[PDB]
Each structure stands twice: as C-alpha cells, then as structure tokens.
Symmetry: C3
Subunit: 138 residues, 3 copies
C-alpha cells in the first residue's frame, strides 16, 4: 500500500507520530518526528524524540524505562538499537546505544527502552536515531 | 503470506524457533523463543536465547563465535546488533552490543555472533534481544 | 520483484554496490561489497567497506562524517547501527558501534556516519557490518 499516518500519545500528552505500511503478516512502522536533515551543504543535524521522566512508569528496574502509550497500533516488535542521550537531574548526560521494542500490555502499546547504568536519576531520554520497526503479525 | 513456523537445531540439540515470511526476493525471519513480556503493569522481563560453549565451533578467533545449525532456512542475512550477556567460566558476566548474521557454509546455516574481548573463557552467551532479519534472496 | 543491482559512487570514484527491491511505498536496499563468508569450516572473515578521509565532507562536526554520493537511489532511510573500525592518521584504530543513515541533500544521496570521539584525526572508516536499510517512501 501507500504509507498511512498514525500516532501514539504519552502519559503527558506528548504525541509520537509515525507512518506505517501493513501487508499480509507484515507491519513496518517508522517514527517520523525526528528525521534528521542536512541544513546546509556541510552540516547534518540530528533530531530527538524527547521522553521526559513523567512519560515513564515507576518503579524502574534494571535500566528499563517503560513508556505507556495510547492509541496507534498494537505490536510485539523486534528489538532495535538506537542512539540515546540520557540526561540526569544534574544536567549531566550520557550518550548510549539503547535498545527499543514495542510490546502490548492490557491492550495498550508500550515502548520498552533499555540502556546502561548512569550515576544519578534520569530527567530525560532523547532518542537521536530514526526508528523503524519491521514486525511479524501472528 | 501468513507467518510460517520453523526452527534451527544446534550441535547440542538446542532448538531455536522462528517464524518467517517469504515473498518475491524477500525473506523476513524473527526468532520467537525469547519475546520479552510485561508480566505486570510495571515490570518488563527480558528473555534469553541461551547459547552454550558446546554450541560453538573451535577454535574461536577474533571474538567471533560460530554456531553451526541444522535444518531451517539458508540465508546470507545482513548484520543485526543485539543485547548480549557474555558469561565466563568464573560466572562473571559482561553486557555487550553483539552483532549477528546468518550465513551459509557447506549447505548448512551458521549463526555468526561477534562481540568484544572479555577477561576469560566463555561458558555461555545469552541473546536478550528479539532478533528479526530482513534478507534479500538472489 | 527480484533484486535489482545498483551502485553509488563516492567523491574519489569509489563504487559502493548494492541490491534492492522496491514495492508500493517500501524500498529495501542492501550493500553487497562486504558480505562476510566462512572461508573454511571454522573461520569467518569480515569484509569492510573502506571509506577514506577524502570521501568525507569538511569540516566534520560532532563525530558526524558525511559521504556525498552520486547516482543510485535517493532515500531518507532509518538509522542502522553498524560495526565500525575507525583508523587514525597514526594507524591506531578503534572498534565502535556506528550509526548510519541515507539522506538526500541538493538532490544528492548522502551517507551519514556517526560514531564516538577518537584521540586524533581520521584516515579511514571501515564498515565491517552487512548493511541493509528498510525504507518508507512518501
């Protein structure tokens, strides 16, 4: 088909836009809010999906941050690695390879974000990567 | 099509289950043994594909562990990065970004797992990520 | 369809070959120059896409190396993580998880390669991973 627009909404009413394509048992979905661009002939700017502390569930265990989501599609995706910037309450920040999945719980989609230990409490996680999941349905 | 079940079997008779879809020149395959789940409203549990020392070929060079496989499909996949937990003979363990491919040798599929140096001999590698390969056939 | 051959060419006339498949809004493209192989029953050899200093734009900022490309297809791909070997002018080298995208600027495709800080100036980046992008067109 052609690519259909859609979105998820976070606990704090942040809107995560995506485009998707669904064929037989296949669902391919890309998040489109942070598609980086070259703004001139020589500079590439990354864009962030910015996820705040209030977007995550509590308690968090094992450097696993869970973003309950409302609306959009309901998939058990594979894991994709992303560029993360993990910002602490003290404004210190750590660049990490994160690992992201979409999963379903209580009929709600949730985004699972896993990363490494940091010396403090998290204020914000920024996903600097353009995320696309290829998923198998059923 | 709809997603067809299948599996590979390791040298020690471990069974690695997958689902796949094959269209024109495309083969998309997901391993399904370790699909993590939220077990309650607040806890996500990762599941592991556990690969033992006896599943790998010897000698191993350059932190490259090769798992000869029997049965299933025969593809030259791209490389996917995964979450690994590399467990040493002394029960010490290291969390790593691994890189995985499927390749064919002697008409047998083999899984290529590459990671970083560790201070010791490996007893076990656990893949904590949900793996899906998108492959081009011919 | 079946997989169509194609290529990009770098500023220094290096040829990057790929195969691709284009369906409705989907474009899937794999680079094929560095498909690793088992050369015997026990040894896997990685192959490199080797990108020289002269293939990149200047100035480089924020450990972002941009390879202007000519020919081939024009896509805004998602980000894929790769195995990189970053070789310095002093022949010292660092193994890294890189992050790669294809982007379009001035109607030209460009390959965006992002990695970590290194103690020196870069002579060469080797991509040791088999790269495939799944892309959404429009």
């Amino acid at each position: 088909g052609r690519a259909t627009n859609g979105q998820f909404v976070t606990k704090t009413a942040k809107v995560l836009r995506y485009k998707f394509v669904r064929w037989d048992a296949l669902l391919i979905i890309q998040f489109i809010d942070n598609i980086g661009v070259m703004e001139n002939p020589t500079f590439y700017r990354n864009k962030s999906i910015e996820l705040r502390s209030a977007d995550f569930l509590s308690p968090m265990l094992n450097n696993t941050y869970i973003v309950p989501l409302n609306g959009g599609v309901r998939v058990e995706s594979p894991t994709i690695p992303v560029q993360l910037e993990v910002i602490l309450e003290n404004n210190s920040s750590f660049i990490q390879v994160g690992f992201v999945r979409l999963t379903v719980k209580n009929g709600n989609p949730h985004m699972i974000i896993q990363c490494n230990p940091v010396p403090g409490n998290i204020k914000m996680i920024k996903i600097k990567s353009v995320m696309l999941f290829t998923c198998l349905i059923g």
